[PDB]
Ligand binder design. Structure first.
Ligand SMILES: O=C(O)/C=C/c1ccc(NC(=O)C2(NC(=O)c3ccc4c(C5CCCCC5)c5n(c4c3)CC(=O)Nc3ccccc3-5)CCCC2)cc1
Ligand SMILES: CNC(=O)c1c(-c2ccc(F)cc2)oc2ccc(-c3cccc(C(=O)NC(C)(C)C)c3)cc12
Length: 545
């Protein structure tokens, strides 16, 4: 069947930013009939995944628990209530949610409506806008009730160490390094599927439900998963922001709670089966939605290229064809996945420290957009958290935004930021404790960065018209002195985040309050399009902190 069908009605709106104008270019790319052929390897991997899903027990979330997971800027319902009313348990929101739940239990077939919109992302010719497909707020709260506990428990039980969303950046690096080191002669590659969401078939969506159905589930959760699969996840009608019928979808909706979990399971299933078809030796896989990395035993240059072509042919039969063909790599640092690569630096005692970095062009361009225009959900803060050990995040992002926060007297104001998938409510004053937990204490002492990494950063600044690194050091000394003078958490930001800026660096001790941070909800599962709100909370705060 066709991934999408269009009525011709426009996808209406609600250093460039992608707009509704280019939506038509994306529609042509994502629209095609799918060809899928399954085999024994696919069937065997599926049964193995189901045997692991069989060990899971999931709970049904209450209306209140689901309501409290709704982000404050979450799209309002077409039934006269918004995210605020949901979060406050307003009688109107709750009554509509309970009626939507009841309708999921009683109607097993009627397709559920979705809104189709062009996403506005900043980029540095110009690429078309990505499309977002999501059901009404009431349905989204119901999705959390039935499946929040499934999507946060099941993927790790099924995929184990291959499940990408269970790791802090520090744990992710450690996993990749250990897997690389475990091979006699390692080879690794990134596999990129062309329009993954469009390649997801109705059968893939039912196979995914067959995995969810192996959980111990409450009867209402079992029925809601069944109804949601048939009425929403396999496909349904598309409506634009003006309420006009846009067409029909028979592929993955990018804005449902199961998008991230579903894509990870599907990509893992197809890839693990394609590893067997290609006869790749001693595979270690890492899967993040549609992003896949395979680390294995090299069998020689020609052998490796041949096995990759066989892998690609098996992925293609499973309806996962590639965008760019995979390339074998013989250095862990040469693999690019999730726009990132591993690099190494030294801590304060000369010991090696591995870390994740990326080309800083897009993060810096988006931070420039966000300093120009007010944006309810930022990427700069997400880039600071994710890339805290990098030279560019420390010297430029931290310096620039802490000087703004000092000037606006907004150091204590919690901000919403997006990191890959999910939405996080963070107080900039908590950045030292967050960084220490995610990256370790060495993130505040890294030096001896690689020439390639220093040169990529310096060239990026020249190309973007950003002042050179020596200006950033002078600005950080001033920012640091002012933060120190404020005491408490502000002085900790000055001392830890800007220790790189002083000639004689201070000896840094662990932050005591870093121990009390509850970060379980952060790196448990992926919620890209899932509509999940994460607000930082601390258990047992000491009086002297
Ligand atoms: O060689 C030497 O000894 C000294 C050289 C030197 C060169 C330029 C300056 N620049 C400045 O003072 C000003 N801009 C900046 O001090 C500035 C700061 C951040 C900038 C950023 C981003 C960096 C990441 C956080 C968000 C802001 C961009 N651009 C920046 C310019 C250049 C710019 O204008 N826009 C963009 C556009 C895309 C990407 C980045 C940028 C402020 C007043 C006059 C212009 C200062 C010193
Ligand atoms: C198969 N791809 C990989 O798992 C990723 C690789 C890679 C893998 C292999 C390789 F060789 C090079 C890069 O680099 C990455 C960089 C970031 C992410 C990534 C994805 C989702 C979440 C988070 C997160 O930290 N969120 C918090 C904790 C909120 C900061 C982070 C995933 C990958």
């Amino acid at each position: 069947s066709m991934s999408y069908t269009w009525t011709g009605a426009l996808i209406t709106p609600c250093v460039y930013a992608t707009t509704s104008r280019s939506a038509s270019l994306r529609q042509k790319k994502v629209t095609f009939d799918r060809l899928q052929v399954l085999d024994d390897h696919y069937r065997d991997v599926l049964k193995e995944m189901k045997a692991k899903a069989s060990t899971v027990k999931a709970k049904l979330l209450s209306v209140e628990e689901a309501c409290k997971l709704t982000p404050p800027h979450s799209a309002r319902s077409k039934f006269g209530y918004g995210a605020k009313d949901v979060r406050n348990l307003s009688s109107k929101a709750v009554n509509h949610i309970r009626s939507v739940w009841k309708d999921l239990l009683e109607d097993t077939e009627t397709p559920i409506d979705t809104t189709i919109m062009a996403k506005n992302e900043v980029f540095c010719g110009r690429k078309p806008a990505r499309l977002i497909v999501f059901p009404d707020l009431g349905v989204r709260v119901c999705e959390k009730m039935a499946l929040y506990d499934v999507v946060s428990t099941l993927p790790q039980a099924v995929m184990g160490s291959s499940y990408g969303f269970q790791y802090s950046p520090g744990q992710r690096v450690e996993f990749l390094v250990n897997a690389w080191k475990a091979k006699k002669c390692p080879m690794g590659f990134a596999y990129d599927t062309r329009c993954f969401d469009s390649t997801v078939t109705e059968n893939d969506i039912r196979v995914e439900e067959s995995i969810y159905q192996c959980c111990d589930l409450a009867p209402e959760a079992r029925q809601a998963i069944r109804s949601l699969t048939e009425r929403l996840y396999i496909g349904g009608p598309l409506t634009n922001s003006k309420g006009q019928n846009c067409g029909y979808r028979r592929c993955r909706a990018s804005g449902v709670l199961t998008t991230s979990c579903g894509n990870t399971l599907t990509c893992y299933l197809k890839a693990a089966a394609a590893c067997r078809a290609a006869k790749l030796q001693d595979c270690t896989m890492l899967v993040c939605g549609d992003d896949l990395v395979v680390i294995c035993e090299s069998a020689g240059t020609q052998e490796d290229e041949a096995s990759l072509r066989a892998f690609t042919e098996a992925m293609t039969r499973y309806s996962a064809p590639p965008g760019d063909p995979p390339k074998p790599e013989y250095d862990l640092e040469l693999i690019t996945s999730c726009s990132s690569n591993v690099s190494v630096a030294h801590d304060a005692s000369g010991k090696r420290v591995y870390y994740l970095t990326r080309d800083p062009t897009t993060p810096l361009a988006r931070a420039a957009w966000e300093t120009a225009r007010h944006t309810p959900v930022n990427s700069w803060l997400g880039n600071i958290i994710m890339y805290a050990p990098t030279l560019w995040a420390r010297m430029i992002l931290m310096t620039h935004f802490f000087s703004i926060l000092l000037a606006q007297e907004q150091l204590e104001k919690a901000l919403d930021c997006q990191i890959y998938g999910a939405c996080y409510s963070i107080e900039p004053l908590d950045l030292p404790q967050i960084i220490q937990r995610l990256h370790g204490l060495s993130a505040f002492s890294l030096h001896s960065y690689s020439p390639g990494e220093i040169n990529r950063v310096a060239s990026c600044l020249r190309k973007l018209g950003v002042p050179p690194l020596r200006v950033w050091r002078h600005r950080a000394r001033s920012v640091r002195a002012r933060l120190l003078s404020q005491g408490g958490r502000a002085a900790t930001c000055g001392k830890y985040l800007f220790n790189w800026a002083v000639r004689t660096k201070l000896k840094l001790t662990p932050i005591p309050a870093a121990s009390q941070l509850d970060l379980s909800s952060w790196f448990v599962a992926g919620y890209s399009g899932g509509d999940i709100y994460h607000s930082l909370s601390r258990a047992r705060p000491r009086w002297f902190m």
